[PDB]
Symmetry: D2
Subunit: 340 residues, 4 copies
């Protein structure tokens, strides 16, 4: 057999019981999800900004980052709907650290039970403070432990074509963004949007930790995320091609632009160059750009695991706080312009 | 909330107790795995052939096929290691019938518990008769119900890059084939193979239907499956590149070619052409092609979902049985030649 | 977990119900018998319920024969007797010792409980499928889910009649239940139990899926006392009179079942024939209160402490098959006379 | 089926995760269990005293009671090992309220999940303050939710002869007292102690709320509790018969004497008469009485839920209890008797 060991996993209700959502958290989640729906509908011209660390690996710095982001979110709330990237799971090209839930101690001890406790506790505190959270829904089982605290979800580029993740999205209570494929393929995401908007029936694990059959109603709050492929795809030239591609599919012509990953050619400072370009489209009148995604942290760049520096990514390189404050105002100014 | 209803699901242990493995089936799966391994390790010059319906949606028409294919398996056994495509789950481009397990009655009634019973019984019978089975591992929970009766599995083109599927593969007891991406990307498959060969720790459901933390050891019996992209990729040209690309990744230069889907340009008919070419390469001495995959049925073509025509696919179009017998012999001959 | 040495996996009830589902006949056997016993307890049938068989099942082979022999008599004496076979898989001990077939089927302290459950339900399904109803002591709180659907009548042991956990269980069983008087001979505990089991209860229990849950029961109106003796026998007309007045005072139907064995036969199997004579006279005399009896019989007579003599009890001593034939006929005549 | 409905039950881990033992709560339990073991082994001459309400029906009054009891626990600790009765499960003669866990709101809404949360939170608070807790282990599934916070347990008179309860005790991490039968029968408790001291294999539910097969090691920290029968059984005469009976069965010759229930002829103030008699036995040299049990509350007597009459605060809704004043005097008498025995 190829399975070496099987260990006990706390059931979702154990985490929900230990860390129940507070009234403030519940409100943060509810208002944030509606606000995003309004933007996706068209009843709102604000820009959805999902911004924060490539991955969370330290609750202390994540808490400090949340406090600074919250101030900006309130200050720029008339132009931006700021949601913090609180990613607990990371998809790897081959092998590597999978995130805080899978291995919180970052030493391959895989204390998943500690991971879930730490993750939910952090998620709860950020929402309770009034700051909404976004995360990638990669794993099929972890959602029951955290979904109630998520205001927006992302389906990775390596799983957007996966029926299992399209199924998951069809039952999620929050808006969902589907990234285009690693090679830059737009089709997989347009297809994913159609599929996740349709009712689904499949096997899942309940809040009680038991497998069951579930039926979903389909998720209408789904959109594409442009994150580049072999070449970047954030340009007006690409945004045009994608708007037409969505209409031809009978979907609203809307996109979220991730300034990182393939769009910045994996060099963190370039996210500022993508920002400038996108802000020109927005300020120019482009009303299809519904939101943006940015990899930001307290300190710029990154560091490897293979004692840590405070507030610096251990996964993808991020822009630092100074660039973050500036990028956010750039986006807000572009929004005030596109308005007129 | 976007969750309509939640219903009871029989735990794996319930399907295993009601439909246990017969001594035959148990040996039919074990021998086949050892054989497939033996081939991947280069201690066998035979060719793995994964052939059968795109999808199983009729145990009757399915049993007749298993019946006919089993003969050819014994007949062409010195050249070919024939394994039937017993696919219970299907990934759709957008939406559609997901397979026997998800909606066996094909009426969107989704009687999955009957689906699992029906599926494991059929799989058990085919295995009992001596014919190995293959399928695509799509779902993360269904594996516990059927895995003990699978001799080879495949990760779909749309899920080869998916970390949850590479995790699943690292813990499966049978050889696994990873299809190249829909656009034809080879790297996703090469990366999947390296990932699947390493140990993993993740969440999964046990035989008791309970989520748990699992540690796998990694699966070395993995390989790529060329299934085409924007353009077909079965020619000696693509094989040569993919052979070079594997070495770069420090992996054995071996491949499986699927004659259908993108390689046949979605024309079951064209599988015979692809067959010729592959036979030419094998006949020429190409020792890299360690296996092939063909989508066939009793009656060629395909139909869509009202009563249905018999033995005709309800998903991807397949070649009929006549072509199958000939195709299987074309391949067996090439093997003898290559030898 | 200081005093917990080990924890092992247990098959959920659905696993046993899936492997061994109840045949159409088995279900009919159970439904009719329960209905019949209900009719007798409601005083709308002058027949006598007769729970007879071994002290404990320890060999499916002998038990299947015993069952075949009894079925002949059940069909024969069917107009005066409602014969139900004692198929006891759990035995409560005074201190320690063998707890029965489910707990340790291999009778070698290997506690292969999962096997015990397979054997027990299979044997119980067989007996029922043939048309012979079954009776057993419900001792464990978790085993009922695996066998209850095949039980027509159940007993609560003298050592657990006063226990609230057993009274709750009884309140939700789908079959009639008999409560034995205390081991010291105390009647009140059984009277209190009938009243307790007749009311609705809410308590924790394990579902068919093997998960704990909150359960609400409706209450069981089909409960009655079983006179099994104490410091001395309590089967005489004098005791019967006293128990009937006791039941009336407690607002319960004045009826009883008399166990010819255990404390009433002073632990001497042969003495069961004497109790039979007495009870027969009572029934012949017009005693409508004696609604049933319980007898410990087997293929052969006696007891043997754990080769094993085939068809011989390994727990309490029983009367042989001949005395059994004589006993069942003696009872049927008495019933004929009463009527 | 006579099964009206089935509802979801939080698994033990959910309660354990929501209400984990604090360092002080875990220390209270480990120290109490060790202290009781020492008394049972005859390595300590103090008297174990399990005292408190017949049943817990109100967390507020339970905590006010625990504060007063803790003060005495600390003051008389040289003579007494005081443990509070925190009983969440009640076995009824026929039907009735089964305790806080089964029906916390005492109105037949049976909110068991809430009951479990309320019970464990109250137990954690009492243990964290340094006061150990005792309870009756009646139900087969509730133990997993609360056992880690129990320092001593009882098997009641109606279940001492039950195999499923003897099996449970054989696997419990705390010392366990077995009450004699309701009719006065001593043998069932002697057999129970012997049965519980042996390893067993049976079916139970895990902390994950799943049924499983379990193997226990046997529990050697078990003893008898004399609680009366048709006649009280606390007198020297009975204590001698029982010590001789345990000896004959090869068990330590020792007993806990419950001053209540049938030993007080169900007259709550008679517990004071039992106390006086037991104190004279202890002060006169009796060493085999290793513990006593007392039904005590803030206010004396009892009240009924079936009278519609509003509930008085700190007054039992099941068996009648002595009030606080008598409790303080009784505890001091016992400590004084122990001091006298030590001489
Ligand atoms: Mn990243
Ligand atoms: Mn296909
Ligand atoms: Mn017996
Ligand atoms: Mn009491």
């Amino acid at each position: 057999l190829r399975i070496k060991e099987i260990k006990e996993l706390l059931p979702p209700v154990a985490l929900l019981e230990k860390f129940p959502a507070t009234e403030n958290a519940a409100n943060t989640v509810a208002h944030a999800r509606k606000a995003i729906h309004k933007i996706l509908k068209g009843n709102d011209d604000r820009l959805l900004v999902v911004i924060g660390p490539c991955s969370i690996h330290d609750p202390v710095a994540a808490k400090e980052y949340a406090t600074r982001l919250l101030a900006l979110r309130e200050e720029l709330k008339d132009e931006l709907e700021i949601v913090m990237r609180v990613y607990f799971e990371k998809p790897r090209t081959t092998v590597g650290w999978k995130g805080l839930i899978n291995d919180p101690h970052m030493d391959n001890s895989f204390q998943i039970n500690d991971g879930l406790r730490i993750a939910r506790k952090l998620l709860l505190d950020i929402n309770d403070s009034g700051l909404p959270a976004a995360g990638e829904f990669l794993d099929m089982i972890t959602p029951q432990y955290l979904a109630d605290l998520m205001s927006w979800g992302a389906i990775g580029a390596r799983t957007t074509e996966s029926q299992v993740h399209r199924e998951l999205a069809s039952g999620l209570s929050c808006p969902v963004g589907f990234k285009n494929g690693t090679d830059g393929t737009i089709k997989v995401a347009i297809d994913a949007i159609n599929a996740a908007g349709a009712p689904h029936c499949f096997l899942s694990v309940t809040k009680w930790g038991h497998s069951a059959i579930v039926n979903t109603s389909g998720n209408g709050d789904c959109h594409i995320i442009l994150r580049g492929g072999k070449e970047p795809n954030y340009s007006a030239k690409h945004v045009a091609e994608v708007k037409e591609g969505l209409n031809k599919a009978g979907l609203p012509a809307q996109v979220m632009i991730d300034f990182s990953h393939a769009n910045s050619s994996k060099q963190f400072k370039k996210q500022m160059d993508v920002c400038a370009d996108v802000c020109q489209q927005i300020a120019g009148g482009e009303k299809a750009i519904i939101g943006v995604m940015v990899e930001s942290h307290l300190v710029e760049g990154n560091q490897s695991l293979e004692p840590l520096a405070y507030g610096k990514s251990i996964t993808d390189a991020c822009i630092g706080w100074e660039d973050t404050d500036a990028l956010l105002r750039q986006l807000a100014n572009a929004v005030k312009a596109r308005r007129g």
